């Protein structure tokens, strides 16, 4: 009879409580930049959506981040560039600097603030107990306060947390994916890294919200603490589903199906069988003891829930026991 509607548990209404221009990216105006002001340097990395450059801004001789966009819809351009200039100067929050478009090519590019080429995903290994809990309440900063601000990332994953560990600096990059939430509103459920991807993404729920972002944290956190990338490790779509079935069990994920009243699709039926709900005990080995503690367990599995509603906020993240020595340590600067 059709799937059952849901809602955030916070920062439900924010955007209705904001002016159109606020989320209506389609109506945009873009304010384009002279892209003579910067020299592109060396070529930092590539991608499926954009290629990122070192460039030098020559009127002030500031060094910047250049992200030059591969052919995509107008619009997807406006929303990422709203998206950008509605989280400017929040927590961890990468800052657009400039918007320029070459005078030939009619190709755009967005110009970011410098940070060193290094992400997550680099440093995770070497990193001890305390800084995986450093950073990770870093990254809470960021997801609550775009959350806060009405606005879902919806590919948090390693390699989009830049990471300045000299100076313990953090942003979180690319949110060419990102959109505003509306309460009733259904999305685009393919999004995100396949590692990364919540079970709502994968049944094809598309009345989803903030707490997709608090699913992928969680697979960070699980890749991290127990030196296993990517921890939910399937083939395709829809055997990654059958990856998380066989941790977190089928039972409780027949029961969010029944509660949503899911139309699953049949190619599930003959690939998902029957799971228990594993302990989180059985990825715990010497080499990784060190990074896993009864708090980061009780922590991981709060957020890796089935049912989006009932995994934690960023808020309630951050005021988990797992970061008690974190938030003591910032009280005392
Ligand atoms: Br700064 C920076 C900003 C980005 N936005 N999307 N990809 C990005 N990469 C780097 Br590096």
Same mark, same amino acid.
């Given at each position: 009879?059709?799937? %059952? ?5 916070? &920062? ?8 159109? =221009?606020?989320?209506? +990216? ?8 002279? !892209? ?28 910047? %981040? ?9 619009? @997807? ?14 927590? /961890?929050? *990468? ?16 110009? #970011? =603030? ?9 440093? &995770? ?9 450093? &950073? ?16 879902? $990332? ?6 989009? %947390? ?22 009733? !509103? ?18 094809? &729920? !598309? ?24 921890? #939910?490790?399937? $083939? ?7 990856? *998380? ?8 994920? +027949?029961?969010? *199906?029944?509660? +949503? /009243? ?5 190619? #599930? ?8 709900? @594993?302990?989180?005990?059985? #990825? %715990? $080995?010497?080499? /990784?003891? $060190? ?27 951050? =005021? ?14």
């Amino acid at each position: 009879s059709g799937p %059952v509607p849901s809602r955030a548990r916070v &920062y439900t209404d924010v955007n209705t409580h904001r002016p159109r =221009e606020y989320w209506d +990216y389609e109506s945009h105006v873009v304010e384009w930049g002279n !892209q003579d002001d910067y020299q592109l340097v060396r070529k930092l990395g590539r991608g499926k959506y954009s290629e990122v450059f070192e460039a030098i801004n020559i009127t002030n001789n500031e060094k910047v %981040v250049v992200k030059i966009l591969k052919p995509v819809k107008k619009k @997807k351009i406006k929303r990422e560039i709203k998206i950008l200039e509605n989280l400017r100067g929040g927590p /961890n929050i *990468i800052t657009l600097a400039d918007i320029v478009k070459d005078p030939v090519s009619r190709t755009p590019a967005l110009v #970011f =603030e410098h940070v060193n080429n290094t992400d997550f995903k680099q440093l &995770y290994q070497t990193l001890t107990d305390y800084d995986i809990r450093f &950073y990770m309440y870093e990254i809470l900063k960021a997801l609550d306060y775009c959350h806060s601000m009405g606005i879902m $990332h919806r590919d948090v994953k390693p390699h989009n %947390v830049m990471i300045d560990h000299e100076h313990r600096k953090l942003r979180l990059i690319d949110w060419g994916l990102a959109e505003f939430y509306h309460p009733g !509103q259904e999305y685009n459920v393919r999004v995100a890294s396949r590692y990364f991807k919540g079970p709502e993404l994968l049944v094809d &729920y !598309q009345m989803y919200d903030y707490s997709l972002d608090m699913w992928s944290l969680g697979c960070m956190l699980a890749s991290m603490i127990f030196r296993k990338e990517p921890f #939910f490790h399937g $083939h395709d779509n829809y055997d990654q589903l059958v990856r *998380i079935a066989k941790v977190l069990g089928t039972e409780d994920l +027949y029961d969010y *199906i029944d509660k +949503y /009243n899911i139309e699953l699709d049949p190619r #599930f039926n003959d690939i998902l069988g029957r799971h228990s709900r @594993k302990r989180w005990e059985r #990825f %715990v $080995h010497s080499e /990784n003891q $060190h990074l896993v503690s009864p708090e980061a367990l009780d922590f991981l599995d709060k957020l890796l829930r089935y049912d989006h509603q009932s995994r934690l906020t960023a808020r309630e993240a951050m =005021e988990h026991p797992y970061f008690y020595t974190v938030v003591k340590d910032q009280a005392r600067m």
